Design a protein around this ligand. Structure first.
Ligand code: CMK
Length: 211
């Protein structure tokens, strides 16, 4: 029974329409610009004006849940306004993962098939435990393949033995958590890597990442 919020600081329309297929019972475009608000409104969207003063989608969602009075317990699925494609079915998966795996933040990943993105700092790497509980997210390749990378010359000699995972920009969290998230001070960790999800891990909170 989730609600979708798309942080949007036409690309957005695709996220928007992919969102509609998700089964979301509400899809809001979160923006900080009149031009985006109007454009968003032009494709039949509920819009929420937010301030410029947010360094992350999660942070912007916090204001959105306040302004709209989204009840604490409502499940919010942040679908970053830059998402390539989302089999909408997955969105329902992550949302239900909150209670399935007993966590305040659920997310998703995809099996990496090209090794060149292992080493791309804009391709965020994620790695979990046996149940999908995240160990760490990084712009650096994780895990490290000592035997293949130690004095590695060709990215194409690299054998990705189903070890690698690329993080997708979709979060599932109840409004109340987004409020808590932003009640935490920004971390050095999230700020070095520029990855909002690292505030949850740093605050001793766990994250679930589904394949
Ligand atoms: N101050 C900001 C910055 C971003 N956004 C919203 O956040 C999304 C940005 O996604 P991103 O910038 O592409 O996101 C990152 C990224 O670094 O690409 C950031 C990071 O927090 C983390 O969530 C990773 C994921 O790991 C997905 O790779 O995704 C955009 O839709 C934007 O409108 C925002 O509202 N306000």
């Amino acid at each position: 029974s989730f609600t979708v919020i798309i942080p949007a600081r036409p690309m957005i329309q695709h996220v928007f329409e992919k969102a509609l297929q998700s089964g979301a019972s509400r899809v809001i475009i979160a923006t900080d610009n009149e031009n985006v608000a109007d454009v968003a409104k032009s494709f039949g969207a509920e819009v929420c004006m937010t301030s410029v003063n947010h360094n992350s989608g999660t942070e912007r969602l916090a204001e959105v849940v306040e302004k709209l009075a989204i009840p604490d317990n409502e499940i919010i699925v942040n679908i970053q306004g830059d998402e390539p494609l989302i089999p909408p079915v997955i969105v329902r998966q992550v949302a239900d993962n909150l209670a399935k795996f007993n966590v305040n933040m659920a997310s998703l990943a995809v099996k990496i098939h090209d090794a060149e993105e292992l080493f791309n700092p804009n391709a965020v790497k994620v790695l979990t435990d046996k149940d999908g509980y995240v160990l760490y997210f990084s712009r650096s390749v994780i895990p490290y393949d000592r035997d293949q990378f130690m004095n590695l010359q060709d990215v194409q000699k690299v054998q990705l033995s189903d070890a690698y995972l690329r993080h997708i920009g979709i979060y599932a969290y109840r409004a109340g958590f987004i409020k808590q998230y932003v009640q935490w001070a920004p971390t050095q960790l999230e700020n070095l890597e520029k990855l909002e999800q690292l505030r949850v891990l740093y605050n001793g909170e766990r994250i679930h990442v589904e394949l």
